[PDB]
Amino acid sequence: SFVHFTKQSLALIEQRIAERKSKEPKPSSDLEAGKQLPFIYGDIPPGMVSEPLEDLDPYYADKKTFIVLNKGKTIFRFNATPALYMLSPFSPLRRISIKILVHSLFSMLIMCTILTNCIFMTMNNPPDWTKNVEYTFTGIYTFESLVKILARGFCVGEFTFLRDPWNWLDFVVIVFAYLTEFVNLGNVSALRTFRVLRALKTISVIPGLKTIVGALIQSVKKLSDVMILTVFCLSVFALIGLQLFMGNLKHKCFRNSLENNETLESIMNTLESEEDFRKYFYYLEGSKDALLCGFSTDSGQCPEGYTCVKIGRNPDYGYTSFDTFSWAFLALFRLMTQDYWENLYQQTLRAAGKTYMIFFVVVIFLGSFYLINLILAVVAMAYEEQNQANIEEAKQKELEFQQMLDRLKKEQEPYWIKFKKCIYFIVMDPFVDLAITICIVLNTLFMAMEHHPMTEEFKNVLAIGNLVFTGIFAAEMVLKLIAMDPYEYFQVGWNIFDSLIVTLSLVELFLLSVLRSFRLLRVFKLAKSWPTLNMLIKIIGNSVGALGNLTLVLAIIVFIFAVVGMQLFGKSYKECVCKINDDCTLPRWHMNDFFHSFLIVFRVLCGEWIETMWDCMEVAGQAMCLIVYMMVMVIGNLVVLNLFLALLLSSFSSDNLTAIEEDPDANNLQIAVTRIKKGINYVKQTLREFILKAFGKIWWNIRKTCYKIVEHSWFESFIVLMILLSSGALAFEDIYIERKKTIKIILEYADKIFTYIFILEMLLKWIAYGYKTYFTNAWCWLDFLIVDVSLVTLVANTLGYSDLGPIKSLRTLRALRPLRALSRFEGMRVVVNALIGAIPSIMNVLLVCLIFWLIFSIMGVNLFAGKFYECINTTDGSRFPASQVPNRSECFALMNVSQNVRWKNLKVNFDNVGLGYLSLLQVATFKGWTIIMYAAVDSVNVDKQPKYEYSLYMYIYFVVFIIFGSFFTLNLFIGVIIDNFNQQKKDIFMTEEQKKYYNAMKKLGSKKPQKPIPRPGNKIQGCIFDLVTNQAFDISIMVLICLNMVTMMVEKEGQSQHMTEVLYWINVVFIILFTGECVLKLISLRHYYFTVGWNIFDFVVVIISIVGMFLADLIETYFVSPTLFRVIRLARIGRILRLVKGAKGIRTLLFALMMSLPALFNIGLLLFLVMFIYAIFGMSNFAYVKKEDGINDMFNFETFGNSMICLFQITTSAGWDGLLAPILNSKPPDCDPKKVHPGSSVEGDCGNPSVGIFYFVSYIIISFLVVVNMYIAVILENFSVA
Amino acid sequence: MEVTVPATLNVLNGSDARLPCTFNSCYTVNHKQFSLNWTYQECNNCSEEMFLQFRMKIINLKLERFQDRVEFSGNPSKYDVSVMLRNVQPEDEGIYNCYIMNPPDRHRGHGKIHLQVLM
Amino acid sequence: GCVEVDSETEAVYGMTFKILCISCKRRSETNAETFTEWTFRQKGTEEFVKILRYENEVLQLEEDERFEGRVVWNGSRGTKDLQDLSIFITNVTYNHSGDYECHVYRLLFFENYEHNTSVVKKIHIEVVDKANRDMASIVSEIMMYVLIVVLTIWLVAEMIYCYKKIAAATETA
C-alpha cells in the first residue's frame, strides 16, 4: 500500500511536479502530521518502520516530502529537500537521525532531562558540583537539536526544524546557554532567568499541553473589547478620584511648637529617618506611616499639640496615593480587585471625610461588581461556544465512524467453600453494611471530640475507643480476605480504599501526629449512598482525570512564576532587606527561597498581591516588580478561571446524564430501610391489635366593617409611615443621646404612641379576618411577635423592674422593629419569597460542605491542638525568643520577676472543633488567615515556646485546604445552582408593576433603523450638512476628545502655575471648539437635533461644561470653597464620557445595566433593611468595646453613621476579623469589667463572644447570599440581552 | 557586600598609584554614619597601619612612613573610595586593606590589594 | 468612649446635686496628666473665688464657709488622667446659687513633646424648692395624649361610618 519511496519514485514525482509547474485544495485534518494513524489500512506491516515512505496525502503529493513511522499511531511528515543542501534524504546519517528522533525512548530522555533541570533550578545557592550537572544538561540538550536539524533542516524550506513555532524556544535556549558559557556580560540574575524557558519544553514534549496552550492563547486574543472597556472605565474613575483627592493622603499632623523658630520647610529638609519623622509628626504606636489628618469636622482629628498640614510622603512607602494619574489608576485597580481595599477606604475617609464614602459605594457597585462579573460572563460564553462546537464535531465524527462500520459490514456481507457460604451472605447482607456505616459516623463524632485542655481519663477513653473502632474495621476486612476471595477483594476501588485505611491504622497502632488524620478519610464511604459526596468525588476525579491536562498546565505555570520570581528578586530580598524590615531580617513573605516564592505566587493567585508588591517595589525597583506581578495575575487568574469553568461545565452536564436509575443495584441502605419500615409497621400493628384485644347579624355587621377598614390605601400608607418613623427613631439612640435631652424625651414618648398604634392595628386585624386567617400567615405571626415584645417591654417599664437583665435584653431586641417593613413593600416581599424557596435546594450541598470542613477541622485540631500559646511582652507585643523562655514553665517563672508578661493565646485558634471551624472560615475568606498561618508555622509542641518557621511546611495544610474546601466546594455549590435553574419548565426578582414597563422597554433596544434625515438644499446651509455628514468630522471630534482626555491626565499634585495656566487655556479652547460643533450641528440639523439621544447628551454636555467653567472661576475668585470647587470642576469629564459613542461594546453593556437595575434595586432595598437592623443592634451592643484592631476612634459602633460605614465595609467581608477581634475579649487582663465611661453609666468595656461571633458570621453569610442572587439577576439579564 | 579590588597592582617607582576600592550597597550613602578604614601592612601576618580614615569627613593621619604623599581620590556617593598615592617609593611595597561600614547593612566590606613597586 | 454632657441647673433646697464638668481629649489613646480647679460666683457677687482643687487623687477645699464639708469628689477615680471633673453637693442651699467655673489643665505626653493646654467650662445653677417639670416633657406628654385621643376619635368615627355603610348595603341587597 506504501512503497519505500525509492530513487525512481522520487525522480518521477519531481519530474511530474516540474512538468506541471512548467505547463502552469486544503490539507485533510484526519491524518495531518502529528494526529494519529488512520484506520483505512488498520495496522502496518512489521517489515518496514521509520523508513522514508511515500507521503500518504494527495494534497502534499504535488509537493516534495515523505512520511515516517515510529511504531505507533503518530505520523510525521518530513521534507524531501536535502538537509542544509549537503545531506540527501536517502543518506544513512539522515535515516539514523530520523530513527532516533522518532523513537519514544528519545522523548522519555528529554522528559527526564527537563524534569531534572526543573528540580535543579529550584536551588537557591547551588554548590560547585552543580556545574558538572549543568554541563551534562547542555550536552544532552545538544544531540537532540542536532538530531532535529539532521532529520529536517535549519531553514531549507517547509517541514524543517524551524518552521514549527515551538522549536524556536529550544534553539534560543541553546544559543543563550552557549553564549553565556564563556562571554561575560550582564548581571548574574538576568542571565540565570532565561534558563526557565527550558520549562516550556515541558509544554513542547508532553502531549495535550500544546492544544491547551493554543486554546488559552486564542481565548486571550479573543478577549480584547472587554479588556479595553475595563481599561477605559478604570481610567475615567481614576480621573474622578484624582480630581476629588489630590494630595489628600499627604495630610499629616505637625507640631504647633517647632522650637528654635524653624519653619516647616526648614524642618523638612534634614528629615530622613522614621524615628526623626517621629519627633515632629504624630505616629500611632507601632505604625510605619504618620497618622492622616482632615480639615472638615467629619474627617479625622489629631491631638491638641498638633495642627494639620499637607506635607510629606504618601502612606505605604509612597505608593498609595491619588496625586499622579498613574498612582490613581493603581489604586482604582486595587479597589477593582478588592485587594486590601479596606485600608484604602479607611485612609481616604480619614484624609478627606466620611462624606466621600459615597465614592467608594459607587465604585464598588460599578467596577468591583459589574465589570468583573461581565468579564467572567464573557469568558464563559467562549467556553459555551467552543465546547458546543467540540461536542458537535465529536458527534459528527462518531456518526461518520458508525456509517463507515456499517458500510464495511455490508461489504463483508468440600474443602472450605461449604463453610464460606455462610459468610458469603453474612458479610454482604444489609445489616452488616448499615452497621459499618453507623460505626463510621460514630467514629467521626468520637474523633471530633479532642481538645487542648483534655483530662487524662478523657484521653485514654479516646484512645481505647479508637482502638475498638480500628479493631472492628480490621476484623471486617479480614472477614472479606480470609473468608472471601483474596483476588476478588481487589476489583473494587472501595475495597482497595478500605484496605489502605486499615493498613495505615495498623501501622499507626504497631508503630508522627499526622497518621491519625488518615482515619478521617473513611467518611467518604458514605459517598456510596449519599449522592452529593459522590458529586464531590466526581469533581475531584475529573480535576485529576479527564481535565488533568489543565491542572498540569496550571502547575507548570505556577512553578515557572515561582522560579522566575526567585531568580529576578531573591538577592534583592537578601541585600536590601532593611528597606522593608526594621529587624533587618527577611519578612514573612519573600522570594529568597523557592518555597517562599511559590507561596507568594499562591497568594497572588488567591487575590492578595499589593502588600507583597510594595516590598517588591521597595527592594527590586518599580518597573520590574510591576511587570512580573501583573503578568502573574493576568496569566494565573485566567488559567484558574478556565479550570474552574471547564470543570464546572463538565461535572454539570458531561457527568450528570441519568444514564442509569437511582442506585440501579439494590442499595444496602435502602434494603435496610425497607426492612426497618416493614418491621416497625408489623410491630405497631401487632401492638395495636393486642391493645384492642385487651380492651343577630350585628357581629357580621361589625366584622365586615373592620375587614374593609384594614384594606384601604389610606390605612396601608398610614401604617407604613408609622413603621418608617418608628424604625428611624431607633437611629438616634447613639452614645450621645444623653447630651440631647429634648430629643430623648420626645423619643421616650413617641415609642408609646407607636406601640398603641400597632396594638390597635393588631386588634383590628384580629377582628377583621379572625384567628384562622391571622395565625396561618407568617407575616402576621412576625408582626404579632414584635408587638408582643413591645407590649412586654411597656408593661415591664410601667411596673418597674427596668434594671432586670432579661428585660434589658428584650429591650435590646427592639432592633427587629424594621422587620415590620418586610411585609408592606412589594419588592422586598418578592425578593424574600424568591430567596426562601432556594434553601432546600442548597441544604444538601451545605451539609456536604459542613462535613468536609469538619474533616479539615479535625485534622487542624490534631495538628495544632493548643500550640498557639506564646510568652508575650505586653508593652510592645514582642514574642520572647525561645532561647530565653523555652516553654510555659519558664514563661510563668518570668511572670514572677517581670511585670508585663503574658502566656497569651490566639483568640481564633484550633483548640476545639468550633474554633477550628471559625479559623477555617477566616482562612477560606482570606481575612485574618495570615495570623493563623504564622502561629501554625511557628508551632513547636504543647506548652512550648514557638520558634520562627519551626514548622514551615505546615503551609501545605492551608494550601491543601484552600485548594479543596474553598475551590472545589464552591464549584459544587455553583454546579447545584445551575441544575436548579435547569429543572424548571421555563424574572422572579421583579414585581408586577415593574413587569409592565420591563416589557414596554424591551422594544427600546430592538428598535427599527432610524429614518435618515432628508437632504436640504439651501445656500450656505447645504455645505454645512456636507460638512457634518461624513466620517471625517466625527472622527476628528473623537480624536479631539481623546486629546482632551490626555490633557486631563497630564494634571498632577505640585505642578506649577505655568502648567495650570496652560491646561486652563487648552481646556478653554476645547470648550470653544465643542460649542462650535454644537452650534454648527444645530444650524445644519434644524429641528432634527434633539431627535437622537446622543445629540441631547452632547447639548447637555456643552451646557454643563460652560456652566462648570463659569462657576469654577467664580468660586476661585470669590467664595473660597475647595470641596465644592472640586465637585463643580467635575463636569469636565462629560466630554470623555461622550467617548462611549461610536463603539458597540459599551452601549450594549449600558443596556444590560439599565435592564438589570430593577432587580438590583429590589435586592439593594432588602440589603439596606438587613444592614439597618444589624447597624441598630451593633449600636445597642458593641458601642463600648475596647478600641483595638479594626475598631478605632473613627470606625466604631458608637453612632449610626459609623455603624453603617463598618457594615458597608464588611458587606464584602473586607476585614471582618478586625472588627470581631475586639469583641472576642471576655475576661481580664484583656478587659475591664468595671470601666467607667464618662457621660453615661454603661460600666463595662468588652462584649459577649457568643453574640459577636453570631453577629459577624451571620452577617457575612447573609451578605454572601444576597450578593449571589444579585449576581444571578444580572447574569440572567445579560444572557437574555446577548 | 561586594567589594571589587585588583588582586595585585604593579606601579613603577616614583609614579602615582591609584588603588581602586569600590563597593555596592542598595542603601543610599550618607556621610553622617558612613565609615571607612584604610590600613597598611608589610605582610599578611604583619601589623596594620591606620593612615586614612572616614568617620564624618576625610581624615588623614599622615603617618611617618608615607609623609604627605597619600590623598583621597574617591567619592562615597558614587561608591568609590579609592585614594591617591603620589611618588611611590620602594619601601611602599606591601598590602593595603579596605574596610567599609555602610549602615544599615551590617556586613564588613573587605578589600585587599597587594601593591608591588617596580623599577 | 467619652461624651460631653452639660450639667443641670435645678438644685433643690435640702437635696443633693451633682455638677458634671466633663472635658475629654480629641484622641483617646493619648496619655495625659489632668487636674482641675472650681471657682464660684454667687448671684449677688462680682468676682469668682476658688473653692476646691483636685490633683493627684487628693481633694483640697479652700477655707470656704458655704462649702465646708458639703462637697465631695465625684469625678474620675484611680487615675492621674481625668476626663470627668464632676463634683457633688450633699446638702443644697441658697448660697449655692451662682455661676461655676471648671478650669481643667491637661499635660499631654507625646514623643519628645510635652503640650500644656487648658479648658474652661461655665455652669449656672439656680436653686429652687420644688423641682418644676421641664417644658419639653410637659409638652411631649400633652401632645402624646392629644394624639392618642384624636387617633381614637378618628378610628371610632370611621367604624361607625362603615357600620352604617355596610348595614345600608346589606339592606339594599
Ligand SMILES: CC(C)CCC[C@@H](C)[C@H]1CC[C@H]2[C@@H]3CC=C4C[C@@H](OC(=O)CCC(=O)O)CC[C@]4(C)[C@H]3CC[C@]12C
Ligand atoms: C460524619 C458525622 C459527622 C455524622 C454526620 C451526620 C451524617 C450521619 C448525615 C449528614 C447528612 C446525611 C445524609 C443526608 C441525605 C442523604 C440522602 C438520602 O437519599 C436521598 O435523599 C435520595 C434522594 C433521591 O434519590 O432522589 C440517603 C441518606 C443520606 C445519604 C444521609 C445519610 C446520613 C448523613 C450523611
Ligand SMILES: C=C(C)[C@@H]1CCC(C)=C[C@H]1c1c(O)cc(CCCCC)cc1O
Ligand atoms: C430554585 C430557585 C429558587 C431559583 C430559580 C431561579 C434561578 C435563576 C435559580 C434558582 C436559585 C437557586 O436554586 C439557588 C440560589 C441561591 C441559594 C441561596 C439563596 C439565599 C439562587 C437561585 O436563584
Ligand SMILES: *[C@@H]1O[C@H](CO)[C@@H](O)[C@H](O)[C@H]1NC(C)=O
Ligand atoms: C449662707 O449665707 C448666709 C448669710 O448670707 C449665712 O447666714 C448662712 O449660714 C450661709 N449658708 C450656707 C449654707 O452657706
Ligand SMILES: *[C@@H]1O[C@H](CO)[C@@H](O)[C@H](O)[C@H]1NC(C)=O
Ligand atoms: C457620687 O457621690 C456619692 C456620695 O458621695 C457617692 O455615693 C457615689 O458613689 C458617687 N458617684 C460617683 C460616680 O462618683
Ligand SMILES: *[C@@H]1O[C@H](CO)[C@@H](O)[C@H](O)[C@H]1NC(C)=O
Ligand atoms: C441638711 O442640713 C440640715 C441641717 O443640719 C439637716 O437637717 C438635713 O438633714 C440635711 N440634709 C441633707 C440631705 O444633708
